[PDB]
Write an enzyme that holds these catalytic residues in place. Structure first.
Site, PDB file in Angstrom:
ATOM      1  N   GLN B  11       0.824  -1.203   0.000  1.00  0.00           N
ATOM      2  CA  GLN B  11       0.000   0.000   0.000  1.00  0.00           C
ATOM      3  C   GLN B  11       0.861   1.257   0.000  1.00  0.00           C
ATOM      4  OE1 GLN B  11      -2.668   2.211  -0.598  1.00  0.00           O
ATOM      5  NE2 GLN B  11      -3.891   0.651   0.450  1.00  0.00           N
ATOM      6  N   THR B 138       1.905  -7.857   3.145  1.00  0.00           N
ATOM      7  CA  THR B 138       2.238  -8.101   1.747  1.00  0.00           C
ATOM      8  C   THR B 138       3.492  -7.342   1.333  1.00  0.00           C
ATOM      9  OG1 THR B 138       1.359  -8.118  -0.510  1.00  0.00           O
ATOM     10  CG2 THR B 138       0.716  -6.268   0.897  1.00  0.00           C
ATOM     11  N   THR B 172      -0.027   2.163  13.120  1.00  0.00           N
ATOM     12  CA  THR B 172      -1.356   1.781  12.660  1.00  0.00           C
ATOM     13  C   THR B 172      -1.767   0.384  13.097  1.00  0.00           C
ATOM     14  OG1 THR B 172      -1.086   3.181  10.705  1.00  0.00           O
ATOM     15  CG2 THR B 172      -2.834   1.525  10.673  1.00  0.00           C
ATOM     16  N   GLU B 247      28.113   5.505  -7.368  1.00  0.00           N
ATOM     17  CA  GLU B 247      29.003   6.154  -6.409  1.00  0.00           C
ATOM     18  C   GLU B 247      28.278   6.518  -5.123  1.00  0.00           C
ATOM     19  OE1 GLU B 247      30.986   4.872  -9.147  1.00  0.00           O
ATOM     20  OE2 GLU B 247      31.738   5.321  -7.145  1.00  0.00           O
TER      21      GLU B 247
HETATM   22  N1  LIG Z   1       4.574   7.169   4.561  1.00  0.00           N
HETATM   23  C1  LIG Z   1       3.587   6.361   4.195  1.00  0.00           C
HETATM   24  N2  LIG Z   1       3.330   5.214   4.917  1.00  0.00           N
HETATM   25  C2  LIG Z   1       2.326   4.385   4.551  1.00  0.00           C
HETATM   26  C3  LIG Z   1       1.551   4.683   3.445  1.00  0.00           C
HETATM   27  N3  LIG Z   1       0.633   3.705   3.304  1.00  0.00           N
HETATM   28  C4  LIG Z   1       0.813   2.797   4.288  1.00  0.00           C
HETATM   29  N4  LIG Z   1       1.852   3.210   5.075  1.00  0.00           N
HETATM   30  C5  LIG Z   1       2.384   2.497   6.248  1.00  0.00           C
HETATM   31  O1  LIG Z   1       2.170   1.109   6.092  1.00  0.00           O
HETATM   32  C6  LIG Z   1       1.772   0.527   7.313  1.00  0.00           C
HETATM   33  C7  LIG Z   1       0.847  -0.661   7.078  1.00  0.00           C
HETATM   34  O2  LIG Z   1       1.143  -1.301   5.857  1.00  0.00           O
HETATM   35  P1  LIG Z   1       0.361  -0.836   4.532  1.00  0.00           P
HETATM   36  O3  LIG Z   1       1.287  -0.098   3.598  1.00  0.00           O
HETATM   37  O4  LIG Z   1      -0.803   0.035   4.929  1.00  0.00           O
HETATM   38  O5  LIG Z   1      -0.177  -2.185   3.844  1.00  0.00           O
HETATM   39  P2  LIG Z   1       0.817  -3.121   3.002  1.00  0.00           P
HETATM   40  O6  LIG Z   1       2.244  -2.649   3.108  1.00  0.00           O
HETATM   41  O7  LIG Z   1       0.349  -3.154   1.568  1.00  0.00           O
HETATM   42  O8  LIG Z   1       0.650  -4.569   3.670  1.00  0.00           O
HETATM   43  P3  LIG Z   1      -0.838  -5.141   3.843  1.00  0.00           P
HETATM   44  O9  LIG Z   1      -1.457  -4.458   5.033  1.00  0.00           O
HETATM   45  O10 LIG Z   1      -0.798  -6.633   4.059  1.00  0.00           O
HETATM   46  O11 LIG Z   1      -1.630  -4.813   2.605  1.00  0.00           O
HETATM   47  C8  LIG Z   1       1.077   1.634   8.082  1.00  0.00           C
HETATM   48  O12 LIG Z   1       1.380   1.547   9.452  1.00  0.00           O
HETATM   49  C9  LIG Z   1       1.644   2.914   7.506  1.00  0.00           C
HETATM   50  O13 LIG Z   1       2.546   3.484   8.422  1.00  0.00           O
HETATM   51  C10 LIG Z   1       1.807   5.830   2.713  1.00  0.00           C
HETATM   52  O14 LIG Z   1       1.117   6.102   1.735  1.00  0.00           O
HETATM   53  N5  LIG Z   1       2.824   6.673   3.093  1.00  0.00           N
HETATM   54 MG   LIG Z   2      -2.541  -3.520   1.435  1.00  0.00          MG
END
Ligand SMILES: Nc1nc2c(ncn2[C@@H]2O[C@H](COP(=O)(O)OP(=O)(O)OP(=O)(O)O)[C@@H](O)[C@H]2O)c(=O)[nH]1
Ligand SMILES: [Mg+2]
Ligand SMILES: Nc1nc2c(ncn2[C@@H]2O[C@H](COP(=O)(O)OP(=O)(O)OP(=O)(O)O)[C@@H](O)[C@H]2O)c(=O)[nH]1
Ligand SMILES: Nc1nc2c(ncn2[C@@H]2O[C@H](COP(=O)(O)OP(=O)(O)O)[C@@H](O)[C@H]2O)c(=O)[nH]1
Ligand SMILES: [Mg+2]
Lengths: 48, 432, 430, 439
Positions: B11, B138, B172, B247
C-alpha cells in the site's frame, strides 16, 4: 390512546454547507502562513 | 543510456510511487496521457515506444486489488502499461508468512518475468529502486522475496530500498514489530542501501514549517517524491560536480554491514512567508543539519556521524559550499568519528527543483538534499527489539504465523541478528 | 473479488438480515426490484461483494434463509425489499423446534440441514474467490442456537481456511423473554467457541439503554434496534467495498484483534448518535467522535468496559479526514487511560480510514474491542445455568431426545475453563 | 425446397400433434385461421415455412401432416375446434369403429380399408414436395389402433419409399403408472414391427415428464396438455436447424450417421433444458455451463431410465440462441472431466453439436418462461435395456397362463407371433448386453 425520527436520524437534513470537507485538509488558512501567492506577480522565482 | 528500474509493492509503496510519478512527468514535461507536447534526459525514467508517447520504467505489485484498480481508473490510466500492474486476489493481511510462503510465490514468477522483459530493453542499467512499507504483511513479504530472488538473478547490481519504519509511539497496526523485524532480517544481507522514512518525523516537519495542522498521506508522499527527484537529478541534468548512484556504495558504506541511512531536505517552506528572506546557502545548509529536520526519529546529537553526502541543486556555488562546510566542521555540537577526517561528499547540479501545482511547497533557486549515516541509528533497532520482546515473552500472535508455514524458531535467529547488528554499531562507534 | 456469502437462521437472525439488506440496498442505491439507479460510479464498482448478477441485468443478494417454521419468512417476503431474495434459497422445516436445543440440533436439524448445506455449497463454489461467511443468530432460541452452530461445524469441516463472522444476540438476565435460555446459550457457546473465527455479542438491554439515553425518543422498537445493529453490520465491511487510505479487510481485523485462538468474542459500537433536536448543535470533529466512541454507554453490550482492561481494539473511520489528527487523538486516548489498557502489548489500537462516509452523514466510526470486561456476561449466564441444573428442572425435555447429562457437565466445565482462562490475562503483568 | 412429412396416428399422436402444430403456427407467425397477417412482404426472400407449411398461392398455408384414427371423436373435435380453417379437410382420416385396445383389430381386420387411403394421401402429399428429407411419426404403443396401424404404415412406407429416413417419437408405457392391462402384448408386437423399420426411435414415457413438471414448474396438477407442450418444444428445437441460421447447421441426416453405431441399436432417450417458470426465471443465472450440466443429470431424462447403470455411446446436443462455441466446448470438456458419466471404450469422441440462432418461442398461457438460451440433447445409452427387460417380465408373467389370448386369436391372429416376439426381444437385449463389454 414518534416524529420523523424513526431510526433515520443517523443521517438527516444536513444542508451541503456542512457537507463540504472540514475547513482545510493539508493547507493553512492562517493569514501569516497562507500558501496563496501575491496577486500581481504570479510567477517569478522569488529568492536572491 | 543510463536507466534505473523502479519497483513498488504494498500500500505505502504504491501510494508513494504515484506521488513520485506525477512529479517526474511534470518535471520532464510529459502529459498524463504520455505524449510530449513540444535533451534526452527522460531516458533515465522513460523509454520511447517508437512513435509518440513514453512509457515509465516502473512496475507495480499488490495482492489486494483496489489500489491498482483506482490507479487504472484514474487520470494516469493511459500512462502505465496495463500488464505491468500486477494484481492478486486476496491481501496478505499483515501476515508476513502469508506474503512470503503462501501466496507470494505464485506472483513472484510473473514479477521476475516482467523484470526480465524490462531489463532486456535497457542497455546501461544503473540500478534498482524499491518502495515498500515495512510494517505491512504483503509489502514485507513481497519485498523480502523479490530482493532475495533478484540478488541471485543479477548478483552485483546496486539496489536501494526506501523503507518506512513504524514510529516510536504512533503506529497503525498492532503486530507490525513482528514483520518489521523479519523484513530487517531478510533485507540486511540483500540490500545495498536502506533509507529510514518513518511517518511521525515528516508529520513534525509539515507541522513546524508549513504550519499544517491536519496533513494527509499526499503531502508526506510529495516530500518523499521531492527527495527522490533531488537524489536522481544528478544523472539527468548537467552540473559542475555530478554523482552517480553507483558512487553511493563507494562513498557511504564503511563496512558491508552498515548501510542504513537517513535523509534530510531543505528548504521545505510555505509560499508566502519564505518570501521575506534570501534563503542563502549558509542558512539552508544549517537547516539541513538542524536535528529536528531529520526525516527519522533519531537524535544525531546522541551519536557520531560516519558519512554525509549532500546534493545541491540550483545556482549554488562551490566556494559558498566550501565556506558552509568549514562552518559546519568548526561547530562543536556536531562531531565526527576519528577515523573519518573528511566525511562530506558534495554534488552540485544547476537544475533547480520543480514545483507541483496545488502543492504545499514553493519555488526557489536553491535546494539541498542530504543523506547521513551515523552511529545513532541503533536507537530504533533497540526500541523495536524491546517492543518485540515484550509481546514475544508470552508468545502472543505467534500461533497464526506458525499455522502458515513458519517454523517456531524463526524469530530466534532474527533476534540474534538484531543483537549482533546493534553490537556492531556499538563496536564501530568506539574511539581508538 | 474476495466476496462473502450471507446465511441466516431463526426469527431473530431473519429480522436482523431483513433490515441489514435494506440498509445495504439503500447504500448502493438499489430499488426493491433489484435494478441499479445509483448516482456515483463508486456505487457499482464493488457490487460483487454482496450481490450476484442475473439475466436481464438485475441483482440478487447471496443470502440463504433457513428455518424450521414458515411463518417468519412468509412475513419477511411480504415486506419491502423482500423481493430481492432468491425464492429457491428459502429452506424451511415443517414442525419447528419450540426453543428446544435438542430438537434444533439432534432430531430435526440433522435431517433438514442437508438441503441448506447443498445450497450453500453451490453458492460458495459459484464465487470466484471466496472470502468468508457472515451469519446472524440469537443464542436464546432453540432452533437458531442449535442449527446455526451445527451448520458452523459442518462448514468448518468443509472450508478450514475461510473466515467466519457471527453476530450473536446473547440473552441478558434483566430483559429475559425465555425461561430456558441458559441451557441453550451454554450448549451453543460450547460449540461456538471451538469453531467460530469471530463472534460478536449484542445485548437487547444495552440497545434499549442506548435508544433511550442517547437517542432520546419515546418509543423504541425492534425496527429501530435492527436498524442500529444493521448500521453496525455495514460499517465493518464498508472498507472492503470502498477505497480508503489504509484498507483493512476482515482477515486484517482478525490478525490485529485476536492474540490467542480461543479469545474471539467481541464488543462493538457505532458513532455518532444524537437526538433529533440536538442534530444542529453538535459539531462533527474527530475529538467528538472518539469521545463518543470510547464512551461506556455507547457500547453495544451491558458489560462495563471500565470494569476490566482492553486487550486490543480497532476503529474504522469513514469520511475524508486527516490522518495525523486521528493518530494523535488515538495516542492521547491511550495515554490518558493507561490503567485500563493491558500494559504488556504496546499500542493496542488499530485505525483504518475509508473515504466514503455513509448515506447523508459527514463522518462515521465503527468500533470493535477485545477486552476482559465480557467475562461478566458469561459469569452470570453460568450462574443461572448451574442454579437451574442443580435441581434438574426442565431437564427431561433435553434428556428425552438422545441428550444426556454428560454433555451438560462437559459444557459447563468448558465454559468455566473459558472464563477462568479469559480472566487469567486480566491481572497478568510483564 | 426442404420438407418433412408428419404422421400422427392414434389418440396420443393426435393430442401431441395439436400442441406441436400450435407451436409451429406461433413460431412462424401464422394466424390460427391460416392467413399470414401481411407485413412479411418486400420480396420475402426466405421460405422459412416450407419445412412445415406450404402456401396455397394467395394467403393461407397448409401443413404437411396427416392425422389417422379409428374413432371419429378427436378428429371431429379438431374439425370443430379453433383450427377448423387450418387443416385440409380430407387429410383428417377418420375411421368408424375403435380398435378397442386390441392389436389384431388394427393390424388384421379393420386397418386395410384405411391404409390404402392413407398411402394415397401420402403419395399425393409427396408429389407436391420436391426435396423431401424424411418422415416423423407420432403414436402411442399401448393402444390398439396406435400400435397396429402405426406398424402397418411403417411396413407399407418401408417398401414404397425405402431409403427415406423415418423417425419415431413413440410413447411407451411407464413402469408402474399406466392405463391399460393389455399394453405389454401390443407393445411387444409393435416393437417387433418397428425394430426393422424405424431408423431412430425416441422414448417418451409419461411419468418422467410428470416428475419433471412437479420438480421444476412446481405444478401439482398437470394434465396431458403440459406434456404435449414439452414434447412439441423438443420437436421444434430439434427441427429448427433446417429453417434457421446457425454456425453449425445439422440436418436430420446427422442422426442415422452419428447416433446409431449398429443397425439394430437405434433406440434413444432425450432430454431438454432449461425448464423454469416465470417466477424463478429472473432470479437465476441460466448460463451455458449450468444448462449443459443440468441436461446430463439423470432426473432430467425424458424416459424412466437411469444412465448411471449403463454406458454412453453417442450424444447429439443442439443449442439455440446466443450460445458461443467456446463455451459449448468448454462445457463439453468439463463434462468429460467429470467422472459419473462414462463412455464406452471404443468411442473416444462421442459428441455431435449443432448451433442455431433462433431463440425458443414462448406460447401464451404456457408454463415455460422466455429465455435467451436453450439446449436439446439426444443420447444413445446401453442402460435402455432395463425398460425392455421389465416389459418382457410384465409380458411373460401373465402370458405363462394364456390370459386374454382368445381376444387376439378369434380376431384372426396366429398364436405363434408371441413366441417369435419374445425371441427377437431376447436377441435385442442380448445384443445390448454384448455391446457393453470392454475391448
Ligand atoms: N509514509 C507512508 N506510509 C504508509 C503509506 N501507506 C501505508 N503506510 C504504512 O504502512 C503501514 C501498514 O502497511 P500498509 O502499507 O498500509 O499495507 P501493506 O504494506 O500493503 O501490507 P498489507 O497491510 O498486508 O496490505 C502503516 O502503518 C503505515 O505506516 C503511505 O502512503 N505513506
Ligand atoms: Mg494492502
Ligand atoms: N403423454 C401422453 N400420453 C397419451 C396422451 N394421450 C394418450 N396417451 C397414451 O395412450 C395410451 C393409450 O392409448 P390411447 O392413445 O388412449 O388409444 P389409442 O392409442 O388411440 O389406441 P385405441 O385405444 O385402440 O384407440 C395411454 O397409455 C397414454 O400413455 C397424451 O395426451 N399425452
Ligand atoms: N434485535 C432483535 N432481536 C430479536 C428480534 N426478534 C427476536 N429477537 C431476540 O430473539 C431472542 C429469542 O430467540 P428466539 O426467537 O427463540 O430464537 P429462535 O428459536 O431461533 O427463533 C429474544 O431474546 C430477542 O431478544 C428482533 O426483531 N430484533
Ligand atoms: Mg382410441
Amino acid at each position: 390512546a414518534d416524529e420523523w425520527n424513526a431510526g433515520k436520524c443517523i443521517s438527516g437534513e444536513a444542508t451541503l454547507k456542512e457537507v463540504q470537507t472540514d475547513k482545510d485538509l493539508g493547507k493553512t488558512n492562517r493569514f501569516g502562513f497562507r500558501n496563496i501567492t501575491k496577486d500581481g506577480d504570479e510567477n517569478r522565482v522569488f529568492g536572491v | 543510456m543510463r536507466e534505473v528500474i523502479s519497483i513498488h509493492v504494498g500500500q505505502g509503496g504504491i501510494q508513494v510511487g504515484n506521488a513520485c510519478w506525477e512529479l517526474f512527468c511534470l518535471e520532464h514535461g510529459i502529459q498524463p496521457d504520455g505524449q510530449m507536447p513540444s535533451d534526452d534526459a527522460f531516458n533515465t525514467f522513460f523509454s520511447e515506444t517508437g512513435a509518440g508517447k513514453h512509457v515509465p520504467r516502473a512496475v507495480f505489485l499488490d495482492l489486494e486489488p483496489t489500489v491498482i484498480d483506482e490507479v487504472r481508473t484514474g487520470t494516469y490510466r493511459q500512462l502505465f502499461h496495463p500488464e505491468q500492474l500486477i494484481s492478486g486476489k486476496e491481501d496478505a493481511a499483515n501476515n508476513f508468512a502469508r506474503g512470503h510462503y503462501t501466496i507470494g510465490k505464485e506472483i513472484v514468477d510473473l514479477c521476475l518475468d516482467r523484470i526480465r522483459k524490462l531489463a532486456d530493453n535497457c542497455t546501461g542499467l544503473q540500478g534498482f529502486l524499491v518502495f515498500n512499507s515495512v510494517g505491512g504483511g504483503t509489502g514485507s513479504g513481497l519485498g523480502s522475496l523479490l530482493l532475495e530472488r533478484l540478488s541471485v538473478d543479477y548478483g552485483k547490481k546496486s539496489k536501494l530500498g526506501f523503507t518506512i519504519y513504524p514510529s516510536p509511539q504512533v503506529s497503525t497496526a498492532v503486530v507490525e514489530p513482528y514483520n518489521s523485524i523479519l523484513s530487517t532480517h531478510s533485507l540486511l544481507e540483500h540490500t545495498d542501501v536502506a533509507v529510514m522514512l518513518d511517518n511521525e518525523a515528516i508529520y513534525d516537519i509539515c507541522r513546524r514549517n508549513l504550519d499544517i495542522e491536519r496533513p494527509t498521506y499526499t503531502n508526506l508522499n510529495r516530500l518523499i517524491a521531492q527527495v527522490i527527484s533531488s537524489l536522481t537529478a544528478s544523472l539527468r541534468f548537467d552540473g559542475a560536480l555530478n554523482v552517480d548512484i553507483t558512487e553511493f556504495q563507494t562513498n557511504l558504506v564503511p563496512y558491508p554491514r552498515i548501510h542504513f541511512m537517513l535523509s534530510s531536505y531543505a528548504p521545505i517552506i510555505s509560499a508566502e512567508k519564505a518570501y521575506h528572506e534570501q534563503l542563502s546557502v549558509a542558512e539552508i545548509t544549517n537547516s539541513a543539519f538542524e536535528p529536528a529536520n531529520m526525516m527519522a526519529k533519531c537524535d544525531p546529537r546522541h551519536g557520531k556521524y560516519m558519512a554525509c553526502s549532500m546534493m545541491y541543486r540550483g545556482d549554488v556555488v562551490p566556494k559558498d559550499v566550501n565556506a558552509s562546510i568549514a562552518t559546519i566542521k568548526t561547530k562543536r555540537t556536531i562531531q565526527f568519528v576519528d577515523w573519518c577526517p573528511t566525511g562530506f561528499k558534495v554534488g552540485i547540479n544547476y537544475q533547480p527543483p520543480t514545483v507541483v501545482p496545488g502543492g504545499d511547497l514553493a519555488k526557489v533557486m536553491r535546494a539541498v538534499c542530504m543523506i547521513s549515516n551515523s552511529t545513532a541509528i541503533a536507537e530504533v533497532f533497540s526500541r523495536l527489539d524491546h517492543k518485540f520482546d515484550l509481546m514475544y515473552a508470552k508468545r502472543a500472535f505467534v500461533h497464526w504465523y506458525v499455522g502458515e508455514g513458519m517454523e517456531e524458531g524463526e524469530f530466534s535467529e532474527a533476534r540474534e541478528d538484531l543483537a549482533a547488528l546493534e553490537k556492531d554499531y556499538e563496536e564501530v562507534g568506539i574511539e581508538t | 473479488m474476495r466476496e462473502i456469502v450471507h446465511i441466516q437462521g431463526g426469527q431473530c437472525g431473519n429480522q436482523i438480515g431483513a433490515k441489514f439488506w435494506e440498509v445495504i440496498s439503500d447504500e448502493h442505491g438499489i430499488d426493491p426490484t433489484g435494478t441499479y439507479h445509483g448516482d456515483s460510479d463508486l456505487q457499482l464498482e464493488r457490487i460483487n461483494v454482496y450481490y450476484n448478477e442475473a439475466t436481464g441485468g438485475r441483482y440478487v443478494p447471496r443470502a440463504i434463509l433457513m428455518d424450521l417454521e414458515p411463518g417468519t419468512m412468509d412475513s419477511v417476503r411480504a415486506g419491502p425489499f423482500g423481493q430481492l431474495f432468491r425464492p429457491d434459497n428459502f429452506v424451511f422445516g415443517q414442525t419447528g423446534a419450540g426453543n428446544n436445543w435438542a430438537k434444533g440440533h439432534y432430531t430435526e436439524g440433522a435431517e433438514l440441514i442437508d438441503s441448506v448445506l447443498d445450497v450453500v455449497r453451490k453458492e460458495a463454489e459459484g464465487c470466484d474467490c471466496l472470502q468468508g461467511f457472515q451469519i446472524t443468530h440469537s443464542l436464546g432460541g432453540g432452533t437458531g442456537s442449535g442449527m446455526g452452530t451445527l451448520l458452523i461445524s459442518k462448514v468448518r469441516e468443509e472450508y478450514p481456511d475461510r473466515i467466519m463472522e457471527t453476530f450473536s444476540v446473547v440473552p441478558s438476565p434483566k430483559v429475559s423473554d425465555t425461561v430456558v435460555e441458559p441451557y441453550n446459550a451454554t450448549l451453543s457457546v460450547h460449540q461456538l467457541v471451538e469453531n467460530a473465527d469471530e463472534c460478536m455479542v449484542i445485548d437487547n438491554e444495552a440497545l434499549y439503554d442506548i435508544c433511550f439515553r442517547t437517542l432520546k425518543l419515546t418509543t423504541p422498537t425492534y425496527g429501530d434496534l435492527n436498524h442500529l445493529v444493521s448500521a453496525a453490520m455495514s460499517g465493518v465491511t464498508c472498507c472492503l467495498r470502498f477505497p480508503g487510505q489504509l484498507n483493512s479487510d476482515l482477515r486484517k481485523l482478525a490478525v490485529n484483534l485476536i492474540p490467542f485462538p480461543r479469545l474471539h468474542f467481541f464488543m462493538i459500537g457505532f458513532a455518532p448518535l444524537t437526538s433529533r433536536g440536538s442534530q444542529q448543535y453538535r459539531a462533527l470533529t474527530v475529538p467528538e467522535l472518539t469521545q463518543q466512541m470510547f464512551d461506556a454507554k455507547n457500547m453495544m453490550c451491558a458489560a462495563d468496559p471500565r470494569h476490566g482492561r482492553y486487550l486490543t481494539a480497532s476503529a474504522l473511520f469513514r469520511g475524508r479526514m486527516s490522518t495525523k489528527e486521528v493518530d494523535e487523538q488515538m495516542l492521547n486516548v491511550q495515554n490518558k487511560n493507561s490503567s485500563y489498557f493491558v500494559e504488556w502489548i504496546p499500542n493496542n489500537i488499530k485505525s483504518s480510514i475509508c473515504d466514503i462516509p455513509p448515506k447523508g452523514l459527514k463522518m462515521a466510526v465503527t468500533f470493535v474491542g477485545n477486552s476482559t470486561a465480557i467475562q461478566e456476561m458469561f459469569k452470570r449466564v453460568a450462574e443461572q445455568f448451574t442454579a437451574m441444573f442443580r435441581r434438574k428442572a426442565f431437564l427431561h425435555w433435553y434428556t428425552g431426545e438422545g441428550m444426556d447429562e454428560m454433555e451438560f457437565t462437559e459444557a459447563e466445565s468448558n465454559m468455566n475453563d473459558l472464563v477462568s482462562e479469559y480472566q487469567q490475562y486480566q491481572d497478568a503483568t510483564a
